[PDB]
């Protein structure tokens, strides 16, 4: 019932496409930041796949962990790794898409 527990359920207990349907309703928007850049920082996007749910969830984790004053390095790694998992799941074995998923993951690991 704590806002931090709710945040963590959205991050870690939903698929990315379910997260996106949660985000559409902006639950608890009095406490949570639902804004996202949709990976506008990535010059290359995959053709034929939509990474936006994963990007939205990654931004949700960074922005809300920072607002909640609990953005430690291990949580950052958890959120980054969850983002890579989301992207790999969207790619479902497509090699070109996987190559982009790795580059997005490396971008957040090194420049996040």
In our burial notation (b when 16+ CB lie closer than 10 A, e otherwise), range 69-97 reads eeeeeeebebbbebbbebbbebbeeeeeb
**Residue 20 burial (CB count, 10 A):** 16
Query: What does the alpha-carbon distance between residue 82 and residue 11 come to, in Å, rounded to a whole number?
Result: 8
H helical segments located in the chain = 3-12, 16-24, 52-67, 73-91, 95-111
Q: Is residue 83 within 8 Å of 11, Cβ to Cβ? A: no
Neighbours of 11 (CB within 10 A): 20
Query: Distance from first CA to last CA of the chain, Å, rounded?
Result: 29
Name the residue ranges covered by the structural domains of the chain: 1-112
The catalytic site residues sit at: 58
């Amino acid at each position: 019932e704590s806002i931090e527990s709710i945040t963590d359920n959205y991050l870690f207990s939903t698929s990315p496409s379910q997260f996106e349907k949660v985000r559409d309703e902006r639950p608890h928007a009095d406490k949570l930041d639902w804004s996202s850049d949709s990976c506008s920082w990535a010059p290359d996007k995959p053709v034929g796949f939509d990474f936006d749910p994963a990007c939205h969830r990654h931004d949700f984790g960074y922005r809300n962990y920072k607002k909640q004053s609990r953005f430690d390095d291990t949580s950052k790694k958890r959120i980054d790794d969850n983002f890579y998992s989301d992207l790999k799941g969207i790619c479902h074995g497509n090699g070109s898409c996987n190559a982009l998923a790795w580059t997005y993951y490396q971008a957040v690991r090194k420049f996040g």
